[PDB]
Amino acid sequence: TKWVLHVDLDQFLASVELRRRPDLRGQPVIVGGSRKVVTCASYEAREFGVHAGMPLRAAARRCPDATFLPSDPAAYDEASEQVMGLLRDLGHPLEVWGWDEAYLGADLPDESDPVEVAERIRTVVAAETGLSCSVGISDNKQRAKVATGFAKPAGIYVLTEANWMTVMGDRPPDALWGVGPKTTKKLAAMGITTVADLAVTDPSVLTTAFGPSTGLWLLLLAKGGGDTEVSS
């Protein structure tokens, strides 16, 4: 059996800063750089509606008691390379995206539980770097990344054909990875508001609205499919 695991570091920039400044643990921390915007908001800060991308002044308005730290890219680079090297050295095909994400493939004995590979990944990363990460598990990239959302924070989650529709069916199309807000507004205008509805929509409805290939890709995503090749 061929599996795909997606690894995502928890509140990466903030976590790296907390190494350098332990006193701040458990408190609203906001990292800001490049007019300056939020580059990473700690989970505590997010409870106040603060999110990556927003201007710092607007962030201060929402979380007056937060501690603002200057962005330090070179430390984030270093911290990421360490983690990525650690992932690569496990021997599986690996594909790195940005600083905090990676997809890795694992061809496993039909009986082996993939969750064990995920528990070792979490342990290695935590033991060697102090950082927590979450791991999504499936048989393609997109579904694995969606699985990661349910694993947050500091967790592991498995999404396959068995539980896919039960977990996703009633959610809006934008819960799918690869389907954004603009596409889901266009879909709402055509009377399509859940993943289950999109999954059984007639191909022609989608292809005339989004073109021949995009129409079909939306069906594949909604059925839980996606890219299967990781390739290092």
Side-chain angles (χ1 to χ4, degrees):
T1 301
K2 209 114 66 156
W3 300 90
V4 173
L5 290 73
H6 168 257
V7 182
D8 196 302
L9 295 172
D10 297 352
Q11 53 182 347
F12 186 54
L13 313 193
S15 302
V16 170
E17 288 301 336
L18 292 192
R19 284 172 174 170
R20 191 201 72 167
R21 231 142 128 13
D23 41 294
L24 300 180
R25 299 191 209 269
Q27 304 171 16
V29 165
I30 293 173
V31 181
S34 72
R35 309 189 114 86
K36 309 180 188 297
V37 298
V38 171
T39 53
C40 184
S42 83
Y43 296 150
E44 293 86 9
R46 292 174 211 190
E47 302 273 20
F48 295 86
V50 174
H51 295 278
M54 72 183 258
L56 294 182
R57 268 170 37 72
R61 174 194 280 138
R62 302 190 189 200
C63 197
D65 293 341
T67 308
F68 291 83
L69 308 171
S71 216
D72 185 12
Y76 310 144
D77 249 297
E78 194 190 306
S80 176
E81 270 160 23
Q82 181 180 11
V83 169
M84 292 319 158
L86 252 14
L87 296 186
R88 197 167 297 273
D89 290 344
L90 294 158
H92 304 287
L94 196 267
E95 200 186 305
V96 175
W97 287 84
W99 279 327
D100 68 323
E101 287 177 81
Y103 287 96
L104 79 70
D107 210 345
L108 253 39
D110 222 291
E111 174 283 348
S112 294
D113 193 353
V115 173
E116 281 162 6
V117 180
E119 300 182 315
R120 292 194 319 256
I121 289 175
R122 295 207 65 249
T123 293
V124 172
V125 173
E128 295 285 301
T129 69
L131 309 170
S132 178
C133 65
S134 303
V135 187
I137 299 177
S138 189
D139 52 8
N140 63 262
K141 298 189 199 161
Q142 285 81 176
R143 201 196 243 149
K145 184 156 176 39
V146 167
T148 310
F150 296 109
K152 294 271 175 187
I156 301 169
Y157 197 96
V158 186
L159 259 182
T160 60
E161 297 298 356
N163 58 339
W164 173 255
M165 207 50 77
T166 297
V167 177
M168 304 298 288
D170 303 322
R171 309 182 180 256
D174 64 298
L176 297 168
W177 182 253
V179 178
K182 294 177 175 204
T183 298
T184 127
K185 274 166 204 322
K186 193 164 162 177
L187 289 171
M190 322 167 195
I192 305 176
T193 59
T194 68
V195 171
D197 292 337
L198 176 59
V200 286
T201 298
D202 188 74
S204 64
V205 168
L206 302 172
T207 60
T208 105
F210 300 92
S213 63
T214 301
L216 275 18
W217 187 245
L218 292 180
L219 286 172
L220 289 165
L221 292 181
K223 294 169 185 286
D227 298 306
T228 60
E229 155 111 323
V230 182
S231 82
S232 303

